[PDB]
Design a protein around this nucleic acid. Structure first.
Ligand SMILES: [Mn+2]
Ligand SMILES: [Mn+2]
Ligand SMILES: [Pt+2]
Ligand SMILES: [Pt+2]
Ligand SMILES: [Pt+2]
Ligand SMILES: [Pt+2]
Ligand SMILES: [Pt+2]
Ligand SMILES: [Pt+2]
Ligand SMILES: [Pt+2]
Ligand SMILES: [Pt+2]
Ligand SMILES: [Pt+2]
Ligand SMILES: [Pt+2]
Ligand SMILES: [Pt+2]
Ligand SMILES: [Pt+2]
Ligand SMILES: [Pt+2]
Ligand SMILES: [Pt+2]
Ligand SMILES: [Pt+2]
Ligand SMILES: [Pt+2]
Ligand SMILES: [Pt+2]
Ligand SMILES: [Pt+2]
Ligand SMILES: [Pt+2]
Ligand SMILES: [Pt+2]
Ligand SMILES: [Pt+2]
Ligand SMILES: [Pt+2]
Ligand SMILES: [Pt+2]
Ligand SMILES: [Pt+2]
Ligand SMILES: [Pt+2]
Ligand SMILES: [Pt+2]
Ligand SMILES: [Pt+2]
Ligand SMILES: [Pt+2]
Ligand SMILES: [Pt+2]
Ligand SMILES: [Pt+2]
Ligand SMILES: [Pt+2]
Ligand SMILES: [Pt+2]
Ligand SMILES: [Pt+2]
Ligand SMILES: [Pt+2]
Ligand SMILES: [Pt+2]
Ligand SMILES: [Pt+2]
Ligand SMILES: [Pt+2]
Ligand SMILES: [Pt+2]
Ligand SMILES: [Pt+2]
Ligand SMILES: [Pt+2]
Ligand SMILES: [Pt+2]
Ligand SMILES: [Pt+2]
Ligand SMILES: [Pt+2]
Ligand SMILES: [Pt+2]
Lengths: 95, 106, 97, 82, 95, 106, 87, 97
DNA sequence: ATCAATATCCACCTGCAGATACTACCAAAAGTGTATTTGGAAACTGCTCCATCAAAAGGCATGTTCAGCTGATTCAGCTGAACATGCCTTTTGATGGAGCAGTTTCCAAATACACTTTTGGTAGTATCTGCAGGTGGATATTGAT
DNA sequence: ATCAATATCCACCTGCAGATACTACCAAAAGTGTATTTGGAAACTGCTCCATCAAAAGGCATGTTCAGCTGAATCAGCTGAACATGCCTTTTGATGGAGCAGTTTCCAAATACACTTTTGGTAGTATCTGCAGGTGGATATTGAT
């Protein structure tokens, strides 16, 4: 009964944006969900450390940004930064 | 009301990501943009893997992505491979690879 | 009367098992071994089915990867046959020994 | 016809693992060496999962227990939760 | 002229306890201070995780004990669990 | 006013350890026994290393523990070695060890 | 500011004798001629990785000075934890 | 004119460097290499001298440990001479690849 | 070479395990609005310690020599691959029950919050001491013969 | 074996770098005491899903044969170790000045409720279909001669 949250619905959405005719088995979806949990933990973990190192009380997008730079390899880092910077602008410049 | 995912122009859930940061004990406080940024990053990497995993499915004459296709996508991409260098994808198997010295003498 | 030369079938098996992803250890024997090892840590334990499955996946991933390193070690010594000293060296270098 | 559980991990099974690992020729002493290696692998992982079970006051080892155990041995597994 | 805490004096007390005629160089002491912090971070961290995994918002001596068992090898774990239990028992009776 | 250290019968600062658990963002709440138990493990561990490090200092006819003594202590003890398997002690060097086949004659 | 020398080919500052000494500490008895360039190569990779993360920590702190702590954090991240520098 | 046979000074030096703890790379050449590499990431940086020393202790421990692994790979090959193929094997098995 | 045995590749077929759409529901996110607390940028400046430098102190670069190591060549005999099948262990799927997990409850122990006491850090100034590195000078270790 | 070059091992030995010592301060810990909230333990139970087992399936233990791999022996050729020699580069100790970091002032941003609307997960239910394997038939590959 108790609620079990998963990233599955949103993974499915993104799949549909990216291969609309392609589907996904349960097991693969389970993997994708692990992957999403794993990466969240890695990035939050590192952001958390950065804040502590610098005696700050807040995890801001700046920490998330540096965390992405420390954790992701070059080209993957570059795109992630831009995707992320892009979404924060879009979010700001909308009522 | 308008949701923060839609404001940020994103499928991934900014609300959830925000909550998880708070209840994750990462810092006393959490800025407003950070769950936005982080949701963006997560969405992106998911698109990246699904992209390549899709292809791998097509290449193999198939429409439904399975664990094998995620494995082939990951280990044939130099960057995704490094990010997941210490990860095991259940039911993924390995890349076909035989050391040449083991090939029959022609 | 027909006969394949030593190693012809071996190559044939490499190709076969590198194509697939099924577990290559029979489920039941693996499960007994898991339970015996666990008995030494706590008595009267039960196991989720997926828990045993997770362990098998991880163990086979592990051993498959160790055999790659092992094989490189054999080849470094200019052999084509893996020997325990190859396993040994792979583990020492991995920082496991 | 009694037999050790470790011996249940059979020569042909080990042979298949090696094959997926791209191994062509296998010395006879490898099978025993492999069983030893697997045994140390499982002890280390199960010990930790069981520690996770006990902490939770359960009598069943959950997949999550194993996944947590794997994560902290630096052998992260995807597909079983978390 | 900000204050930088270390474990030095505590490390020195204990050193006098076990080798009363032996000194410690300040580089050795620096390493010792790093060791203490490091182990502290590794135990608290396991403790943190362990609580989350069990939906608990409190780190207790019981979380610490499991962390100790997760983190320390064999015989050091055994002795640490005694020393810790001992100090908590003693502490419980002493107010 | 007896310090919590003395109440538990400890050299290591229980007050300090309790404080650092709060600021470290490890959980919402810290139990009263936790810094007590932790300060004791911390003190047991440092006693173990100083014991063995002092022995190395003495084996060496020296009165002061230097980083090489910590290194000989850790590396010569199976369990400390493993606990600090992925740690580098500055100025500790290595254990004398020369592989058999490298020695002269036969 | 007025002029500052150009840094190039400092890898060769890691001399043949220095590398030989390191191999000795590592228990090595005989060293083939090509080891020296291989080792310089390997070392430059090691340093690039550590310095990149350390510099990242530096910039995030908004400093112009790479601290011992920045290096100690960079090392911790790569699983090469270092004791003896405040870390 | 006196001569130690090849191998003898080498073993003497092993005992010598295994016994001591001083850094084996000259300081200034090392500091320059650090500044070159760092500058290529970001111009106008300064270094605390302890940052450079920390990098040196880390780098020398890394290279000494790699040479031990490398030595083991050579011996596995029934040689006593370390070669680039040995270093490449050590690094491959270590996951540095 | 040709030839025949057996593995592999492919096109097409189909039942069903497992993917999906569709409805009703609710508890619990997720958000919107109003009342409050603060974390940390900014604007300034003491002051530690970094880049820079001149003289002094010792390690590196080079070329010659040949000892002995690597890598090539060959070979014998040891050891693991290939082989075929029915015994016997594993797989499958059906069935009581153990314990995980959902729910309610209630207080031992958590945080918060305000004065009260203590102590661990540094900073200024002083005397002490373990050993790094110099010395000569008796005890090995090595390699020629 | 015995002889001689030259590294190695002590033992003592004076300078000093860094360790240890006190006397003062003090901001910030750490402690103390009462007022307030609550997390999670304790206990009862419902229903997954787990261990057991009968019947069905289908992989492995088995011994023989011998192909071809491993490791032993031999050795030419050459690379890397030792060392002499000539001298460049690094180490060491001294100094104005960049930037870190110490303190204080202030508001844009976050936490905290509270109240209002929602969506994501579940669960019953039925509805759908991609593809694992089956088949059968051509075609490639391997090994025999
Ligand atoms: Mn597309
Ligand atoms: Mn440059
Ligand atoms: Pt944390
Ligand atoms: Pt299963
Ligand atoms: Pt062998
Ligand atoms: Pt889970
Ligand atoms: Pt620090
Ligand atoms: Pt330095
Ligand atoms: Pt070579
Ligand atoms: Pt032919
Ligand atoms: Pt159909
Ligand atoms: Pt809210
Ligand atoms: Pt403030
Ligand atoms: Pt000299
Ligand atoms: Pt000189
Ligand atoms: Pt010769
Ligand atoms: Pt050879
Ligand atoms: Pt033969
Ligand atoms: Pt045999
Ligand atoms: Pt059969
Ligand atoms: Pt039942
Ligand atoms: Pt029951
Ligand atoms: Pt029950
Ligand atoms: Pt329960
Ligand atoms: Pt004091
Ligand atoms: Pt005091
Ligand atoms: Pt002082
Ligand atoms: Pt001396
Ligand atoms: Pt002398
Ligand atoms: Pt002398
Ligand atoms: Pt307090
Ligand atoms: Pt409650
Ligand atoms: Pt509760
Ligand atoms: Pt059958
Ligand atoms: Pt033969
Ligand atoms: Pt020759
Ligand atoms: Pt040469
Ligand atoms: Pt200035
Ligand atoms: Pt300035
Ligand atoms: Pt600043
Ligand atoms: Pt909502
Ligand atoms: Pt919905
Ligand atoms: Pt809805
Ligand atoms: Pt098929
Ligand atoms: Pt067929
Ligand atoms: Pt057919």
């Amino acid at each position: 009964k108790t609620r079990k949250e998963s990233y599955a619905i949103y993974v499915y959405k993104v799949l549909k944006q990216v291969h609309p005719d392609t589907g996904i088995s349960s097991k693969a979806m389970s993997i994708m969900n692990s992957f999403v949990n794993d990466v969240f933990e890695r990035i939050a973990g590192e952001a958390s450390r950065l804040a502590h190192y610098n005696k700050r009380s807040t995890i801001t997008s700046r920490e998330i940004q540096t965390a992405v730079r420390l954790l992701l390899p070059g080209e993957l880092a570059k795109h992630a930064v831009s995707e992320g910077t892009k979404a924060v602008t879009k979010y700001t410049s909308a009522k | 009301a308008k949701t923060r995912s839609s404001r940020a122009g994103l499928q991934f859930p900014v609300g959830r990501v925000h909550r998880l940061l708070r209840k994750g004990n990462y810092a006393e406080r959490v800025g407003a943009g950070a769950p936005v940024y982080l949701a963006a990053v997560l969405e992106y990497l998911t698109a990246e893997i699904l992209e390549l995993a899709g292809n791998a499915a097509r290449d193999n004459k198939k429409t439904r992505i399975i664990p094998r296709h995620l494995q082939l996508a990951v280990r044939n991409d130099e960057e995704l491979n490094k990010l997941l260098g210490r990860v095991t994808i259940a039911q993924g198997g390995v890349l076909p690879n035989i050391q040449s010295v083991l090939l029959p003498k022609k | 009367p027909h006969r394949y030369r030593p190693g012809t079938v071996a190559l044939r098996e490499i190709r076969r098992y590198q194509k697939s992803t099924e577990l290559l250890i029979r489920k039941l024997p693996f499960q007994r071994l898991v339970r015996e090892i666990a008995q030494d840590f706590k008595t009267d334990l039960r196991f989720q089915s997926s828990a045993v499955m997770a362990l098998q996946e991880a163990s086979e991933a592990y051993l498959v990867a160790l055999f790659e390193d092992t094989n490189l070690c054999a080849i470094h010594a200019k052999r084509v046959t893996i020997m325990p000293k190859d396993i040994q060296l792979a583990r020492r270098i991995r920082g496991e020994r | 016809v009694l037999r050790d559980n470790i011996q249940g991990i059979t020569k042909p099974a080990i042979r298949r693992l090696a094959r997926r690992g791209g191994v062509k020729r296998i010395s006879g002493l490898i099978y025993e060496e492999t069983r030893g290696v697997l045994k140390v692998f499982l002890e280390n992982v199960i010990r930790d999962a069981v520690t996770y079970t006990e902490h939770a006051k359960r009598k069943t080892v959950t997949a999550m227990d194993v996944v947590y155990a794997l994560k902290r041995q630096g052998r992260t597994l995807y597909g079983f939760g978390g």
